[PDB]
Amino acid sequence: SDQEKRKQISVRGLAGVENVTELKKNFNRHLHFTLVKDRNVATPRDYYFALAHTVRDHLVGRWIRTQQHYYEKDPKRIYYLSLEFYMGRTLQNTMVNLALENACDEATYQLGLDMEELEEIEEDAGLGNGGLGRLAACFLDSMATLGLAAYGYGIRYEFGIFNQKICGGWQMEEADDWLRYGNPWEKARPEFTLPVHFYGRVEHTSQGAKWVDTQVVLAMPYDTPVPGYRNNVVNTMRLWSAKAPNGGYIQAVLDRNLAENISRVLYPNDNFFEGKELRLKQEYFVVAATLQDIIRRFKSSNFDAFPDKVAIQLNDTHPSLAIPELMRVLVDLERLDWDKAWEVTVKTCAYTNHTVLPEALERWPVHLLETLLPRHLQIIYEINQRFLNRVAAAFPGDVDRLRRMSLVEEGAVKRINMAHLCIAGSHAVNGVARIHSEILKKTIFKDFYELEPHKFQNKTNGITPRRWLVLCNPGLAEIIAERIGEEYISDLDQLRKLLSYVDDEAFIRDVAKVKQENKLKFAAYLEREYKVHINPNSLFDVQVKRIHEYKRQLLNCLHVITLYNRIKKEPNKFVVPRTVMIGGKAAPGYHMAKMIIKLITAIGDVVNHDPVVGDRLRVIFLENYRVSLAEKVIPAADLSEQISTAGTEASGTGNMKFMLNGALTIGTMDGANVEMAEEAGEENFFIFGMRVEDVDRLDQRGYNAQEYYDRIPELRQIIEQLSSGFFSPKQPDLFKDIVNMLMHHDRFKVFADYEEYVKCQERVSALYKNPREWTRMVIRNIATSGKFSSDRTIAQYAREIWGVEPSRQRLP
Amino acid sequence: SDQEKRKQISVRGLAGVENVTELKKNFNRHLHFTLVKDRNVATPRDYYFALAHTVRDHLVGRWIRTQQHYYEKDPKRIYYLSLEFYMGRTLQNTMVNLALENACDEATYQLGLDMEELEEIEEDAGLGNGGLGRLAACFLDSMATLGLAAYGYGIRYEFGIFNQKICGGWQMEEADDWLRYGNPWEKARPEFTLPVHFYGRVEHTSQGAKWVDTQVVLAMPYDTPVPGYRNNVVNTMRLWSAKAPNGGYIQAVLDRNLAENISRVLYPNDNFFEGKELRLKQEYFVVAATLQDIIRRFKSSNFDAFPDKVAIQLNDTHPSLAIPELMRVLVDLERLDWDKAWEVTVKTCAYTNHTVLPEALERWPVHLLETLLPRHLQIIYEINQRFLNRVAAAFPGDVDRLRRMSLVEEGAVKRINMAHLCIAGSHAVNGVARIHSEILKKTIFKDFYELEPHKFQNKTNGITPRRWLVLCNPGLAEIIAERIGEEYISDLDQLRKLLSYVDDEAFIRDVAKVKQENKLKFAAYLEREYKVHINPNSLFDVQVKRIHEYKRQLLNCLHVITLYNRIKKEPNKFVVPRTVMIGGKAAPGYHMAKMIIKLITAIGDVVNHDPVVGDRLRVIFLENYRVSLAEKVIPAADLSEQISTAGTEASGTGNMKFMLNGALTIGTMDGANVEMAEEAGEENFFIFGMRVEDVDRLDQRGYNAQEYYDRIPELRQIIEQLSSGFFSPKQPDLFKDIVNMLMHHDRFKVFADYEEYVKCQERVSALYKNPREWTRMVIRNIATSGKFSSDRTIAQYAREIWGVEPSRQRLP
Ligand SMILES: CC[n+]1c(C)c(C(=O)OC(C)C)c(-c2ccccc2Cl)c(C(=O)O)c1C(=O)O
Ligand SMILES: CC[n+]1c(C)c(C(=O)OC(C)C)c(-c2ccccc2Cl)c(C(=O)O)c1C(=O)O
Ligand SMILES: *Cc1c(COP(=O)(O)O)cnc(C)c1O
Numbered sequence A, B: 001s002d003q004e005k006r007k008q009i010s011v012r013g014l015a016g017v018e019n020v021t022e023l024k025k026n027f028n029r030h031l032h033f034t035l036v037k038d039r040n041v042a043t044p045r046d047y048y049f050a051l052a053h054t055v056r057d058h059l060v061g062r063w064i065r066t067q068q069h070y071y072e073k074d075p076k077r078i079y080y081l082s083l084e085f086y087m088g089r090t091l092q093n094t095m096v097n098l099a100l101e102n103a104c105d106e107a108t109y110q111l112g113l114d115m116e117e118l119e120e121i122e123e124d125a126g127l128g129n130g131g132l133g134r135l136a137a138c139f140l141d142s143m144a145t146l147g148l149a150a151y152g153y154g155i156r157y158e159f160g161i162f163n164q165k166i167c168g169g170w171q172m173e174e175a176d177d178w179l180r181y182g183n184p185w186e187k188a189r190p191e192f193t194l195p196v197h198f199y200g201r202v203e204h205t206s207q208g209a210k211w212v213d214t215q216v217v218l219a220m221p222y223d224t225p226v227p228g229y230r231n232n233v234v235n236t237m238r239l240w241s242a243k244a245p246n247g248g249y250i251q252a253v254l255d256r257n258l259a260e261n262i263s264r265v266l267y268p269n270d271n272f273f274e275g276k277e278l279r280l281k282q283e284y285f286v287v288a289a290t291l292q293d294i295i296r297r298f299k300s301s302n303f304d305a306f307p308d309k310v311a312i313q314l315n316d317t318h319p320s321l322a323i324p325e326l327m328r329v330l331v332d333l334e335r336l337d338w339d340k341a342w343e344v345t346v347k348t349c350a351y352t353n354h355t356v357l358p359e360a361l362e363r364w365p366v367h368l369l370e371t372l373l374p375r376h377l378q379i380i381y382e383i384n385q386r387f388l389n390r391v392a393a394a395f396p397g398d399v400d401r402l403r404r405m406s407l408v409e410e411g412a413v414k415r416i417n418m419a420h421l422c423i424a425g426s427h428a429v430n431g432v433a434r435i436h437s438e439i440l441k442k443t444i445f446k447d448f449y450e451l452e453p454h455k456f457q458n459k460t461n462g463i464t465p466r467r468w469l470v471l472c473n474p475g476l477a478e479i480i481a482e483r484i485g486e487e488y489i490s491d492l493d494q495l496r497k498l499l500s501y502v503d504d505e506a507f508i509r510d511v512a513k514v515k516q517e518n519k520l521k522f523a524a525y526l527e528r529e530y531k532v533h534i535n536p537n538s539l540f541d542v543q544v545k546r547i548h549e550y551k552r553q554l555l556n557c558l559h560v561i562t563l564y565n566r567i568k569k570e571p572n573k574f575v576v577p578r579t580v581m582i583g584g585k586a587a588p589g590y591h592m593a594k595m596i597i598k599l600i601t602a603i604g605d606v607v608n609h610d611p612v613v614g615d616r617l618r619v620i621f622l623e624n625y626r627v628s629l630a631e632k633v634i635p636a637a638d639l640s641e642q643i644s645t646a647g648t649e650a651s652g653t654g655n656m657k658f659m660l661n662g663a664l665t666i667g668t669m670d671g672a673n674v675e676m677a678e679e680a681g682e683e684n685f686f687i688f689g690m691r692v693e694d695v696d697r698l699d700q701r702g703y704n705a706q707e708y709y710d711r712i713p714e715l716r717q718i719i720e721q722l723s724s725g726f727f728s729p730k731q732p733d734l735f736k737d738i739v740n741m742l743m744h745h746d747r748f749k750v751f752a753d754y755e756e757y758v759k760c761q762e763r764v765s766a767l768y769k770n771p772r773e774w775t776r777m778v779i780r781n782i783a784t785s786g787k788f789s790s791d792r793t794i795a796q797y798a799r800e801i802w803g804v805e806p807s808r809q810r811l812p
């Protein structure tokens, strides 16, 4: 009796067995009881919510069963700490991974509703800036699919990356109020709310050190379920929210907003460091809370065993404070000896580097750290002293090496090099692509690689074949399925078997049919939502990614102006029709990126209205590029632009998405482009321009953009057009800053790759003129994209870093 | 087909038929699917939520059916506009009104859970300061129970009235974060979000006037269901939330908090005007949005008929801007002629006055109104000019009357008298108790009553017998039920039949048993939650209400010190044991009220620890008095303190709650005390002190507190104790401000009612010495409390103001 009567309370029976009858029944239940509405007044969004709740209900039993499982079994747990999780929409992905997509589709049909229309109501969970944030998301999905006891820990931003609008040809930012109508996926967990301390001071009592007189901010966790692919595994992504603890009474209540501002907005900086204190607060916030929850879970089924049960993976140096924080807790609170604590920390943490550009790396002024986190700065200084002590003993007399490896950067404003802190405190540091990992060992991390070679590894990036194929390209996924089955969805290497169809007329006809369907659908979407008309019988040339100087959208601009100038030159000469699409957001305070977006639209203003050009060349800027737009435009792309200056793009992932969806790649030998060309065969790729050693040689003697301007008539014509106001009649000097940078301050040598790029583009159109051959080369790409599935990347992290074994064994 | 297939989507079948089996089934469903939890990790609060969701599900079918009904039938709609709705908890009230209390109680029993424990997890929706806010709440409940198409419109405050804590004997305020774990009762309605304009300017174009260049703030409505008593009627309370519309990008996103601050906190001022701009914003916010929604509903099944379909009731002058706003919309937007629009407005609005104290009435400086609401000030000036024109024609030559009746108050700071605006723009102005309504006609509103006598009415306040008897006092409700049935719950006048039992030994034994049970329960609650020990065999003397000078808690203080001094004087003389309880909150910036709370605890510090006093007299301050605490302490009260200075308390409602729950009243002839004494018979009451005419006479010759001090030795002793530091040893002069006020600046003549009060208290204890006679007099009170049920008050408002007929006919 009594406590035995609570056995009734169980997950035992849910909404049935996963079919149409019960699904409709539950959709109805949610529409009336959850939305307190009826068919007469239900709005489309209401219907979207009804469906989402019905679908989420299917997650619960598995969600609870999975966490119970990890508790029972107690496997080593993997913690992915990141300040970004670019998740995009969840509805379709959840249905796909639970195998409910067809049933929901039928159920909503019989209820007279259109599921596709409803799925469009859901807005992106854009809690990320780009690559790094999307990778976290692909990683969550792969770890679930691989049966890993993995937890994604981040910040629940009230406002994700701003929604971009184009006004007058310029980018205008708008707050991304994504939680306005609520979030059907998350589940708050008040009982797990934790305190995070700021400021205060440090007093050294008999015992040890004490952090006193601090300002407290509470961290409330919100759980979102992450389902593996049909294995009945549902993992958790825990995002922390800032809550105030509990000039007059009124103002004091209004001021609660100050402490809760911590989790308000995602800093919109992609590959750029801004040392704003609010950002440092967000970083410590997610770290402190996350570590408390990790230790709690560790204590609930001494610290010697911590590394055997815990793996903390740092996505960049953003959550690097986890290293000194873990030490603070172990030494200050758990009273462990410094060295034993240090051993534990290094064995627990592993750091992932995502770039090599100096401006993108974190260097926090010490004054900011001493006022905001006094004891962390003290611990960092002690970590430094003991680390430098080791290099001094390993390289006696090498004082300059000491200076270069120090965690502290002397100068006008003393700063703390976060990347150095991570290497000292992690047992593994990794690059995200073979070429990037190698550059790390030879350049920026060279000193460290010499002191501890074992520490450095490579983990080439990936994307999940679920969201990035099955989800976004059902057509491609089905034709691939009719030939080789469905086992590829969680074994992408099987795509290899498609090579056997390179000469199959049916498959060749199918691949091209699917691509043109997607191109048709995307064109319909653009005209409906933006009243933008694009020629579906043109070659879709697409470059989507954040606007950057290093990504060289500018190089792409030079090419489209060349295409236009050549046409005007020889109007009656035939050219492969092209629809050049460029999309991506610019960080708010990044002037040049904002100038580039304006140049793109400026070019379009001329090109798209020239009667002699007509249907032959259209240049359009895809507004507000985000995960959901990527799922639409990438499957409709013919040519994938991946033209970053060699050695600047650590890896790239969009490149992989394009390859997996039937697009041929034109790019440099940079990041993962190198490994993609190796997998398909360079004969099936469109590699061009300088190689890393080539830019290095150019650097040694000096890059003089004037030389290329003096030597290339076609290039001179374009710059003259830009300078003279040909693309800005009403404001002639509008692009002077772009021209000036190109001519005298181009760190990315655009002019130096112009000629080879244009010629390589000629060969792309030459191949496009032959559909059959274009299609056959596409096949050889898709068939070799298998190594770029995040399941492979994750399996390597697991076995080579975390020390855990992946598994595709389903749960009941 | 197609649209005929959507007929399936219906409320048709819910969680069954309202019994234990299905209830458990649904509680379980909610615990797993709604809370994403299971029995192993479910927290008590989780269980509280599970139950609340299960119960709320029972509301939906009725909720939808009721609104559908009003749409179909299209009755005249009643809109209750108020800046406060003191709703307290909803769980029990919902169960009670739906007749699910027993089933839920059994269902939770079989699931091994304790419903009472779970109900305590829910916190108060304290969106009110006191009487005025509670009245709105009682009114919502009565209008539902009476089958009226009524809508409560207010502001969804993120923070209700602060939670009061006592530290060092003083009140400390804490933000009331009532939405922390969510609100299971409300349902947001994004699709009904509306824009509210501020600042800007007015330009007069050909057509008319235009309000341009304004700052916009969005108003998102949240619906809470309000169930009638077992009639299947569920009405709506719509509360608006502030949302920003859509120094750098980051700061701009953080600054969204400024516009959303509008609905952040409830101003904690009870009976006091503070002209803060943020308050004016809240007032316009609720008015603008509410009126847009009202006109929408009016247009969706010309304006001549507006008054026949709409009734806007102003709870005080807080939402008075509704008058100029309705004119603005009708003239500016709907282009109606001024006079036709004015006719419409007056016929639509009716104003309710709640006080007579000058400091509690609204007078907004014109400079504040011209910058924040330029066109409203213009419309107010035009309303004034035309109103003054009428009085001038009705009283030719009376220029001073013009000056006194003007909506504009000249002087250093020109201001707008809101009360005057309401009288000019309402077809009915009403007081809240017979004596109050009469004072209005003779004093403050005299000029207006002379110009338009038809306009002035009285509507004596009430409380709902559901929350205030059935809910809070099940014991009393049951014994009353076993004698006369249950029809009284919605026909309180039936309580009259209890007079027939005044000499029934069974009933007399029962009434006293129920009261002692409640006294026992309350004592248990106080010791458990506050480790406060109270003698259950003492007479519970209780004064709970907001701390005020006019409510005279100070007079009560003088009495308890007298009780203590008399005991010390004659230690071995027998005295009726008393537990004097005083509770209530002080507005943050109200010094004297804060000094009073400190004096109360100070007195307790001496009294409660004097060994010679022992169990004979205990003085305790009930911390954080709110609706839920009222439901606990009032049913356990023996003596109800209602001692405001005659003519200051417009009506009071707590007085009614005490009478309905078996407590005898000691009070002045003020507010509704007068009508309560009339109903029970003054022989069954404990009326004392000056009458209105007595304070007026004292005012004419001047109030000299020194006279009473010179003439009353016992009074002199107390003041000497206060001044000398007897109740504040460590800080001798701690209460000098209280003494000084009493001696020379007492607007409420405490000293003048001291003697009669003490003597009247003697007669209370004389009666308490005779349980049988005390109980019989209690019976005669409860049996005559029937006129004070809000159902009666509401029925009068309906028939005499709104022009609609109440009804107890159930819906299917
Ligand atoms: C006690 C062991 N855990 C387990 C079996 C969980 C569970 O049943 O979760 C289901 C409701 C999704 C889960 C958990 C525990 C308590 C409150 C809320 C959650 Cl969510 C966690 C966690 O940290 O999240 C566990 C852990 O490990 O400490
Ligand atoms: C179209 C007529 N109304 C009606 C039958 C309602 C209803 O079915 O409500 C149920 C979901 C609780 C209700 C309504 C209408 C549209 C969206 C949300 C609500 Cl809530 C209202 C309202 O203003 O609240 C109605 C009104 O009158 O305009
Ligand atoms: C994949 C992805 C990225 C990263 O793209 P790269 O071209 O590798 O820089 C950025 N944004 C979105 C929305 C993505 O889906």
Ligand SMILES: *Cc1c(COP(=O)(O)O)cnc(C)c1O
Pocket (backbone or CB within 6 Å): B129, B130, B131, B134, B544, B545, B546, B625, B626, B627, B628, B630, B651, B652, B653, B654, B655, B657
């Ligand atoms: C009824 C009520 C009031 C009003 O009480 P009065 O004594 O009439 O001033 C104030 N506060 C609460 C919590 C109430 O329930």
Ligand SMILES: Cn1c(=O)c2c(ncn2C)n(C)c1=O
Pocket (backbone or CB within 6 Å): A269, A270, A271, A272, A359, A548, A587, A588, A589, A590, A591
């Ligand atoms: C110079 N600069 C910036 O100023 C910048 C930026 N991203 C954001 N900002 C503000 N990037 C990438 C950049 O190179």
Ligand SMILES: Cn1c(=O)c2c(ncn2C)n(C)c1=O
Pocket (backbone or CB within 6 Å): B269, B270, B271, B272, B359, B548, B587, B588, B589, B590, B591
């Ligand atoms: C003088 N005074 C105040 O100063 C006050 C108040 N309520 C709030 N405040 C700030 N009351 C009722 C009051 O009489």
